[PDB]
Enzyme design. Structure first.
Site, PDB file in Angstrom:
ATOM      1  N   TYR B  27      33.936 -77.847  60.247  1.00 38.59           N
ATOM      2  CA  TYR B  27      34.128 -77.931  61.683  1.00 38.59           C
ATOM      3  C   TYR B  27      34.841 -76.797  62.393  1.00 38.59           C
ATOM      4  O   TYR B  27      34.861 -76.779  63.605  1.00 38.59           O
ATOM      5  CB  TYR B  27      34.821 -79.247  62.015  1.00 38.59           C
ATOM      6  CG  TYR B  27      33.930 -80.438  61.764  1.00 38.59           C
ATOM      7  CD1 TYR B  27      32.996 -80.848  62.718  1.00 38.59           C
ATOM      8  CD2 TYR B  27      33.975 -81.118  60.554  1.00 38.59           C
ATOM      9  CE1 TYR B  27      32.127 -81.908  62.466  1.00 38.59           C
ATOM     10  CE2 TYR B  27      33.111 -82.178  60.290  1.00 38.59           C
ATOM     11  CZ  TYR B  27      32.192 -82.568  61.248  1.00 38.59           C
ATOM     12  OH  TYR B  27      31.335 -83.616  60.986  1.00 38.59           O
ATOM     13  N   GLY B  29      34.356 -73.660  63.539  1.00 34.31           N
ATOM     14  CA  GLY B  29      33.339 -72.657  63.797  1.00 34.31           C
ATOM     15  C   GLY B  29      32.367 -73.194  64.828  1.00 34.31           C
ATOM     16  O   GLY B  29      32.786 -73.673  65.881  1.00 34.31           O
ATOM     17  N   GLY B  31      29.548 -75.064  63.607  1.00 34.73           N
ATOM     18  CA  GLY B  31      28.978 -76.236  62.970  1.00 34.73           C
ATOM     19  C   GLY B  31      29.550 -77.520  63.538  1.00 34.73           C
ATOM     20  O   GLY B  31      30.382 -77.490  64.447  1.00 34.73           O
ATOM     21  N   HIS B  47      39.297 -81.438  67.454  1.00 35.75           N
ATOM     22  CA  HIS B  47      39.187 -80.507  68.573  1.00 35.75           C
ATOM     23  C   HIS B  47      37.798 -80.632  69.190  1.00 35.75           C
ATOM     24  O   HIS B  47      37.649 -80.628  70.412  1.00 35.75           O
ATOM     25  CB  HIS B  47      39.437 -79.073  68.091  1.00 35.75           C
ATOM     26  CG  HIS B  47      39.508 -78.061  69.193  1.00 35.75           C
ATOM     27  ND1 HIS B  47      38.582 -77.049  69.331  1.00 35.75           N
ATOM     28  CD2 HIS B  47      40.411 -77.885  70.189  1.00 35.75           C
ATOM     29  CE1 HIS B  47      38.915 -76.289  70.361  1.00 35.75           C
ATOM     30  NE2 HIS B  47      40.020 -76.774  70.899  1.00 35.75           N
ATOM     31  N   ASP B  48      36.782 -80.757  68.337  1.00 32.26           N
ATOM     32  CA  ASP B  48      35.408 -80.899  68.806  1.00 32.26           C
ATOM     33  C   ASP B  48      35.228 -82.185  69.597  1.00 32.26           C
ATOM     34  O   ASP B  48      34.558 -82.205  70.626  1.00 32.26           O
ATOM     35  CB  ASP B  48      34.430 -80.889  67.627  1.00 32.26           C
ATOM     36  CG  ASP B  48      34.152 -79.496  67.119  1.00 32.26           C
ATOM     37  OD1 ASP B  48      34.358 -78.545  67.897  1.00 32.26           O
ATOM     38  OD2 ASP B  48      33.715 -79.351  65.957  1.00 32.26           O
ATOM     39  N   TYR B  51      36.819 -81.755  73.030  1.00 32.47           N
ATOM     40  CA  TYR B  51      35.919 -80.952  73.857  1.00 32.47           C
ATOM     41  C   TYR B  51      34.689 -81.755  74.249  1.00 32.47           C
ATOM     42  O   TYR B  51      34.146 -81.589  75.342  1.00 32.47           O
ATOM     43  CB  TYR B  51      35.454 -79.726  73.075  1.00 32.47           C
ATOM     44  CG  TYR B  51      36.294 -78.481  73.242  1.00 32.47           C
ATOM     45  CD1 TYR B  51      37.590 -78.538  73.750  1.00 32.47           C
ATOM     46  CD2 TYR B  51      35.787 -77.239  72.865  1.00 32.47           C
ATOM     47  CE1 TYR B  51      38.360 -77.382  73.875  1.00 32.47           C
ATOM     48  CE2 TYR B  51      36.541 -76.090  72.986  1.00 32.47           C
ATOM     49  CZ  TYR B  51      37.822 -76.163  73.488  1.00 32.47           C
ATOM     50  OH  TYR B  51      38.561 -75.015  73.585  1.00 32.47           O
ATOM     51  N   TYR B  64      41.989 -70.587  81.560  1.00 32.64           N
ATOM     52  CA  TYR B  64      43.116 -71.363  82.055  1.00 32.64           C
ATOM     53  C   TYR B  64      44.408 -70.651  81.705  1.00 32.64           C
ATOM     54  O   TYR B  64      44.426 -69.754  80.860  1.00 32.64           O
ATOM     55  CB  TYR B  64      43.099 -72.779  81.460  1.00 32.64           C
ATOM     56  CG  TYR B  64      43.296 -72.841  79.959  1.00 32.64           C
ATOM     57  CD1 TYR B  64      44.570 -72.768  79.396  1.00 32.64           C
ATOM     58  CD2 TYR B  64      42.203 -72.957  79.103  1.00 32.64           C
ATOM     59  CE1 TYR B  64      44.749 -72.810  78.014  1.00 32.64           C
ATOM     60  CE2 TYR B  64      42.371 -72.998  77.721  1.00 32.64           C
ATOM     61  CZ  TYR B  64      43.643 -72.925  77.184  1.00 32.64           C
ATOM     62  OH  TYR B  64      43.809 -72.972  75.819  1.00 32.64           O
ATOM     63  N   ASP B  89      43.158 -77.636  73.273  1.00 34.32           N
ATOM     64  CA  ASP B  89      43.503 -76.457  72.495  1.00 34.32           C
ATOM     65  C   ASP B  89      44.917 -76.553  71.946  1.00 34.32           C
ATOM     66  O   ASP B  89      45.159 -76.233  70.782  1.00 34.32           O
ATOM     67  CB  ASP B  89      43.372 -75.187  73.347  1.00 34.32           C
ATOM     68  CG  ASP B  89      41.933 -74.859  73.699  1.00 34.32           C
ATOM     69  OD1 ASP B  89      41.009 -75.437  73.087  1.00 34.32           O
ATOM     70  OD2 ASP B  89      41.722 -74.006  74.589  1.00 34.32           O
TER      71      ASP B  89
END
Lengths: 5, 121
Positions: B27, B29, B31, B47-48, B51, B64, B89
């Site tokens: 994860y 990257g 992918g 994190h994915d 997002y 930001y 983030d």
């Protein structure tokens, strides 16, 4: 000034 | 954007997000499939998902601003998107830091073909 994902 | 996220990662981990975390596990990257390889990889998975819950925004592109108060990252008020992106983030950068003790070099340059199967957020 440098992370992906 | 990757600019802000990369800055946090360096400040928190002392490592350049690229190439340190840009090809890690399944994860960290571009992918997004399979079972996360370890704690650091799970940070990217989360994190994915964060997002993925910002449909009305452009996580990777939107710029930001953020500050550091008392040694900690502080997401100040901007647009709703800027604030939420910053928080996703921030959470991941700290997650990377908290799990540096198990960061494994063997998971760098990890081939996505080894990662398959959608995992629910």
């Amino acid at each position: 000034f440098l992370s992906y994902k | 954007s990757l600019l802000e996220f990369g800055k946090m990662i360096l400040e928190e981990t002392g490592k350049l997000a690229i190439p340190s975390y840009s090809s890690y596990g399944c994860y960290c990257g571009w992918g997004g499939k399979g079972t996360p390889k370890d704690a650091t990889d799970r940070c990217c998975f989360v994190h994915d998902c964060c997002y993925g819950n910002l449909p009305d925004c452009n996580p990777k592109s939107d710029r930001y601003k953020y500050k550091r108060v008392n040694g900690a990252i502080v997401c100040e008020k901007g647009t709703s998107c800027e604030n939420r992106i910053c928080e996703c983030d921030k959470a991941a950068a700290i997650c990377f830091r908290q799990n540096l003790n198990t960061y494994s070099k063997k998971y760098m340059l990890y081939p996505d073909f080894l990662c398959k199967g959608e995992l629910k957020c």
